[PDB]
Amino acid sequence: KSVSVILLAGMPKQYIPLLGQPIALYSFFTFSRMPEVKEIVVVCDPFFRDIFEEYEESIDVDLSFAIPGKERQDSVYSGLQEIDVNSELVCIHDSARPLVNTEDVEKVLKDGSAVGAAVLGVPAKATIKEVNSDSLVVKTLDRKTLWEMQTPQVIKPELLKKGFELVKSEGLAVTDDVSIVEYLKHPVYVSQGSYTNIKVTTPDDLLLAERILS
Amino acid sequence: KSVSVILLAGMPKQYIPLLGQPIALYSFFTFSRMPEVKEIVVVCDPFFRDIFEEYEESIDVDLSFAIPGKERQDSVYSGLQEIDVNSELVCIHDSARPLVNTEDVEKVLKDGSAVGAAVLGVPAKATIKEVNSDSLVVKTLDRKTLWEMQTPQVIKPELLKKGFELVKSEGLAVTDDVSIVEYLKHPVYVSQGSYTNIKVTTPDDLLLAERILS
Ligand SMILES: [K+]
Ligand SMILES: [K+]
Ligand SMILES: [K+]
Ligand SMILES: [K+]
């Protein structure tokens, strides 16, 4: 249908098995089962293409591949160059987050469609404080006001392309995909997600993934 | 010598054994071994007093007890009423953080002594963003600028007492001990600590504690 997924996956921690399946395939299959998703552009080294290639005939999406870049936004840009010319949303996901819920992907897809840009997030749990160059607390930031960003980050393609034109033209710096949209003064909605949508990096995260998958 | 510790410890997660020792005793012993610490005022239900009471003769501090309160700042206030009348610093610690390093306690003690108030913190790892009442990103907060707060929080007693007088007189709200000091417009130094100084709440944290203790 209308959404193009850019799956970022470029032994690497995202191919470490979780219940004997590479971590990257969990989110991959989650997107493939959703009626809204037309295609998945996978961003990975050609070494690991086989891992996704095996299931092309089963899954109900058109599959594509793109070459990774030196940095995270370079990979997204490479991914972006492959999508259907009529895709209505780009859904950018980090494969190191295997536990993303179908329900939460649906939510951020809807919010992305309504607002133009949206990202899954959860309230920042820890007491965070603003600190200046002299290591002094500037103020305690309001606890309602702070949110941890996860993925997917969902952005209209025209918006993302226009955003990439600005970044390149003025050598601008980027954290995440929605930071690109922030430069445009176009709104970014934070869709409330789940604390379970963790990023798996350490062995303690890997064990955590299993305990949630139970 | 000059520091009074207020240990907050009021089956509760802080008495769950870590390598067969209740989590609360780890930090307790760490403070007891430091020449700067004169006394430890433990804040716990009288049920659990025995857990600390057993080691009174071994440890080189004067031990004290205080009754917990309905909220976290009520317990700190109860703890505060017991300290030596000549203590130069109050070192407030959450017993659910057993892995605090001697070296990091030394650092925050020094910074507390120099500034009047100090707290151990580490750079906030996740991409945090400011979000308004309409769930829209206000701005992406600078990555140098955000820090997670741990404990100890170290405060001069006169400062803390004066801070408690303000909070009570104007029914003011509090997150942490240093937020009390922030109301006073007195500076709070953030002493750079260690990511290992985690708070143990879940079984995955408990497993994490063990893996660091190795
Ligand atoms: K589909
Ligand atoms: K992590
Ligand atoms: K001592
Ligand atoms: K936790």
Side-chain angles (χ1 to χ4, degrees):
Chain A
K1 195 183 88 82
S2 61
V3 180
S4 299
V5 177
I6 299 177
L7 187 63
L8 301 172
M11 195 174 200
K13 80 199 154 192
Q14 72 268 11
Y15 302 115
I16 286 188
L18 180 63
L19 306 196
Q21 186 174 253
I23 277 158
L25 281 161
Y26 279 82
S27 69
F28 177 78
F29 288 133
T30 300
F31 295 126
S32 71
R33 289 192 272 277
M34 299 183 67
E36 287 85 358
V37 178
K38 177 156 199 292
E39 62 188 344
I40 301 179
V41 178
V42 179
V43 178
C44 66
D45 188 68
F47 187 91
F48 296 97
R49 284 174 180 178
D50 284 354
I51 298 196
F52 307 94
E53 192 68 56
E54 189 172 4
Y55 306 97
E56 190 185 358
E57 299 203 61
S58 317
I59 67 184
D60 190 34
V61 300
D62 291 335
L63 182 62
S64 278
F65 288 105
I67 297 297
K70 198 222 173 75
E71 265 140 51
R72 199 251 188 190
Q73 77 282 355
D74 299 310
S75 294
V76 175
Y77 191 76
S78 187
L80 180 57
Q81 303 322 283
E82 308 297 5
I83 69 181
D84 181 326
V85 300
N86 275 19
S87 202
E88 313 202 59
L89 288 177
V90 191
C91 172
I92 305 156
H93 187 69
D94 182 32
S95 57
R97 294 177 186 281
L99 308 183
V100 68
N101 298 334
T102 297
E103 295 88 345
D104 291 328
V105 179
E106 289 271 11
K107 178 185 263 168
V108 69
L109 288 176
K110 153 199 56 126
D111 294 332
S113 180
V115 180
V119 52
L120 278 178
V122 293
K125 293 292 255 167
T127 302
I128 312 294
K129 293 195 193 256
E130 190 173 338
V131 192
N132 64 33
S133 53
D134 289 332
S135 307
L136 300 174
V137 169
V138 181
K139 52 184 198 85
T140 306
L141 288 97
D142 200 4
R143 205 129 204 171
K144 310 151 198 77
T145 228
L146 298 189
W147 292 71
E148 288 189 358
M149 299 290 99
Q150 313 173 323
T151 71
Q153 315 204 165
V154 179
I155 311 166
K156 286 178 168 157
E158 63 266 35
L159 207 62
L160 187 56
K161 287 164 174 168
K162 217 265 177 155
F164 268 108
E165 288 170 8
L166 185 73
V167 156
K168 294 184 206 296
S169 67
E170 307 195 303
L172 225 37
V174 287
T175 9
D176 53 39
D177 321 289
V178 298
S179 75
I180 296 166
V181 179
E182 284 161 52
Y183 288 118
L184 301 173
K185 303 200 168 190
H186 188 94
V188 180
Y189 193 91
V190 184
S191 301
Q192 180 153 25
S194 295
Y195 292 109
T196 49
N197 185 28
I198 58 159
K199 185 180 166 89
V200 191
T201 63
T202 61
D204 298 83
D205 294 338
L206 211 205
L207 256 93
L208 187 46
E210 293 194 329
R211 206 196 139 276
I212 289 118
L213 293 173
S214 288
Chain B
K1 195 183 88 82
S2 61
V3 180
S4 299
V5 177
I6 299 177
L7 187 63
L8 301 172
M11 195 174 200
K13 80 199 154 192
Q14 72 268 11
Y15 302 115
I16 286 188
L18 180 63
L19 306 196
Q21 186 174 253
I23 277 158
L25 281 161
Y26 279 82
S27 69
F28 177 78
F29 288 133
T30 300
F31 295 126
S32 71
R33 289 192 272 277
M34 299 183 67
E36 287 85 358
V37 178
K38 177 156 199 292
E39 62 188 344
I40 301 179
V41 178
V42 179
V43 178
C44 66
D45 188 68
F47 187 91
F48 296 97
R49 284 174 180 178
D50 284 354
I51 298 196
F52 307 94
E53 192 68 56
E54 189 172 4
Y55 306 97
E56 190 185 358
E57 299 203 61
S58 317
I59 67 184
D60 190 34
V61 300
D62 291 335
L63 182 62
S64 278
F65 288 105
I67 297 297
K70 198 222 173 75
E71 265 140 51
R72 199 251 188 190
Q73 77 282 355
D74 299 310
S75 294
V76 175
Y77 191 76
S78 187
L80 180 57
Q81 303 322 283
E82 308 297 5
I83 69 181
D84 181 326
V85 300
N86 275 19
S87 202
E88 313 202 59
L89 288 177
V90 191
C91 172
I92 305 156
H93 187 69
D94 182 32
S95 57
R97 294 177 186 281
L99 308 183
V100 68
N101 298 334
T102 297
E103 295 88 345
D104 291 328
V105 179
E106 289 271 11
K107 178 185 263 168
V108 69
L109 288 176
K110 153 199 56 126
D111 294 332
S113 180
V115 180
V119 52
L120 278 178
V122 293
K125 293 292 255 167
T127 302
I128 312 294
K129 293 195 193 256
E130 190 173 338
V131 192
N132 64 33
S133 53
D134 289 332
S135 307
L136 300 174
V137 169
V138 181
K139 52 184 198 85
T140 306
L141 288 97
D142 200 4
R143 205 129 204 171
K144 310 151 198 77
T145 228
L146 298 189
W147 292 71
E148 288 189 358
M149 299 290 99
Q150 313 173 323
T151 71
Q153 315 204 165
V154 179
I155 311 166
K156 286 178 168 157
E158 63 266 35
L159 207 62
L160 187 56
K161 287 164 174 168
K162 217 265 177 155
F164 268 108
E165 288 170 8
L166 185 73
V167 156
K168 294 184 206 296
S169 67
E170 307 195 303
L172 225 37
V174 287
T175 9
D176 53 39
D177 321 289
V178 298
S179 75
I180 296 166
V181 179
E182 284 161 52
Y183 288 118
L184 301 173
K185 303 200 168 190
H186 188 94
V188 180
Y189 193 91
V190 184
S191 301
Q192 180 153 25
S194 295
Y195 292 109
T196 49
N197 185 28
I198 58 159
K199 185 180 166 89
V200 191
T201 63
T202 61
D204 298 83
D205 294 338
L206 211 205
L207 256 93
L208 187 46
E210 293 194 329
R211 206 196 139 276
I212 289 118
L213 293 173
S214 288

PDB file of all heavy atoms in Angstrom, chain A residues 31-35 37 60-61, ligand 1:
ATOM      1  N   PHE A  31       6.999  -5.487  10.161  1.00  0.00           N
ATOM      2  CA  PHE A  31       6.622  -4.558   9.082  1.00  0.00           C
ATOM      3  C   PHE A  31       5.992  -5.279   7.899  1.00  0.00           C
ATOM      4  O   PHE A  31       5.009  -4.798   7.331  1.00  0.00           O
ATOM      5  CB  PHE A  31       7.824  -3.748   8.582  1.00  0.00           C
ATOM      6  CG  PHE A  31       8.402  -2.810   9.609  1.00  0.00           C
ATOM      7  CD1 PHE A  31       9.759  -2.853   9.923  1.00  0.00           C
ATOM      8  CD2 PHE A  31       7.599  -1.869  10.253  1.00  0.00           C
ATOM      9  CE1 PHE A  31      10.302  -1.994  10.866  1.00  0.00           C
ATOM     10  CE2 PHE A  31       8.137  -1.000  11.193  1.00  0.00           C
ATOM     11  CZ  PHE A  31       9.492  -1.065  11.504  1.00  0.00           C
ATOM     12  N   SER A  32       6.561  -6.434   7.548  1.00  0.00           N
ATOM     13  CA  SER A  32       6.090  -7.230   6.414  1.00  0.00           C
ATOM     14  C   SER A  32       4.637  -7.686   6.548  1.00  0.00           C
ATOM     15  O   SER A  32       3.949  -7.779   5.542  1.00  0.00           O
ATOM     16  CB  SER A  32       6.993  -8.444   6.191  1.00  0.00           C
ATOM     17  OG  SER A  32       6.833  -9.406   7.221  1.00  0.00           O
ATOM     18  N   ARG A  33       4.173  -7.927   7.777  1.00  0.00           N
ATOM     19  CA  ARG A  33       2.780  -8.343   8.051  1.00  0.00           C
ATOM     20  C   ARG A  33       1.728  -7.225   8.027  1.00  0.00           C
ATOM     21  O   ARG A  33       0.535  -7.509   8.052  1.00  0.00           O
ATOM     22  CB  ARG A  33       2.689  -9.040   9.414  1.00  0.00           C
ATOM     23  CG  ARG A  33       3.327 -10.413   9.463  1.00  0.00           C
ATOM     24  CD  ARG A  33       2.952 -11.166  10.733  1.00  0.00           C
ATOM     25  NE  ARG A  33       3.866 -10.890  11.845  1.00  0.00           N
ATOM     26  CZ  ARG A  33       5.048 -11.484  12.048  1.00  0.00           C
ATOM     27  NH1 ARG A  33       5.519 -12.410  11.210  1.00  0.00           N
ATOM     28  NH2 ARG A  33       5.778 -11.142  13.108  1.00  0.00           N
ATOM     29  N   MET A  34       2.157  -5.967   8.007  1.00  0.00           N
ATOM     30  CA  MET A  34       1.245  -4.838   8.075  1.00  0.00           C
ATOM     31  C   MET A  34       0.772  -4.463   6.678  1.00  0.00           C
ATOM     32  O   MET A  34       1.620  -4.207   5.815  1.00  0.00           O
ATOM     33  CB  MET A  34       1.950  -3.641   8.686  1.00  0.00           C
ATOM     34  CG  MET A  34       2.426  -3.886  10.103  1.00  0.00           C
ATOM     35  SD  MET A  34       3.168  -2.413  10.809  1.00  0.00           S
ATOM     36  CE  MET A  34       1.727  -1.360  10.907  1.00  0.00           C
ATOM     37  N   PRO A  35      -0.562  -4.448   6.431  1.00  0.00           N
ATOM     38  CA  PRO A  35      -1.166  -4.030   5.148  1.00  0.00           C
ATOM     39  C   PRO A  35      -0.703  -2.679   4.591  1.00  0.00           C
ATOM     40  O   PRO A  35      -0.674  -2.504   3.368  1.00  0.00           O
ATOM     41  CB  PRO A  35      -2.656  -3.970   5.476  1.00  0.00           C
ATOM     42  CG  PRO A  35      -2.833  -5.016   6.513  1.00  0.00           C
ATOM     43  CD  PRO A  35      -1.603  -4.926   7.368  1.00  0.00           C
ATOM     44  N   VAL A  37       2.329  -1.425   4.657  1.00  0.00           N
ATOM     45  CA  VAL A  37       3.706  -1.450   4.164  1.00  0.00           C
ATOM     46  C   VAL A  37       3.764  -2.053   2.761  1.00  0.00           C
ATOM     47  O   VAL A  37       3.458  -3.229   2.581  1.00  0.00           O
ATOM     48  CB  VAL A  37       4.638  -2.206   5.132  1.00  0.00           C
ATOM     49  CG1 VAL A  37       6.064  -2.263   4.588  1.00  0.00           C
ATOM     50  CG2 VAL A  37       4.606  -1.555   6.513  1.00  0.00           C
ATOM     51  N   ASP A  60       4.698 -10.431   2.337  1.00  0.00           N
ATOM     52  CA  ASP A  60       3.815  -9.726   1.406  1.00  0.00           C
ATOM     53  C   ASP A  60       4.252  -8.257   1.222  1.00  0.00           C
ATOM     54  O   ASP A  60       3.433  -7.341   1.324  1.00  0.00           O
ATOM     55  CB  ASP A  60       2.356  -9.863   1.892  1.00  0.00           C
ATOM     56  CG  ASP A  60       1.322  -9.367   0.871  1.00  0.00           C
ATOM     57  OD1 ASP A  60       1.542  -9.511  -0.351  1.00  0.00           O
ATOM     58  OD2 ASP A  60       0.271  -8.841   1.301  1.00  0.00           O
ATOM     59  N   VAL A  61       5.547  -8.048   0.965  1.00  0.00           N
ATOM     60  CA  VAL A  61       6.113  -6.740   0.573  1.00  0.00           C
ATOM     61  C   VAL A  61       7.042  -6.934  -0.620  1.00  0.00           C
ATOM     62  O   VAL A  61       7.537  -8.042  -0.841  1.00  0.00           O
ATOM     63  CB  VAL A  61       6.953  -6.069   1.695  1.00  0.00           C
ATOM     64  CG1 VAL A  61       6.120  -5.815   2.918  1.00  0.00           C
ATOM     65  CG2 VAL A  61       8.175  -6.894   2.086  1.00  0.00           C
TER      66      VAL A  61
HETATM   67  K     K C   1       2.341  -5.935   3.905  1.00  0.00           K
END
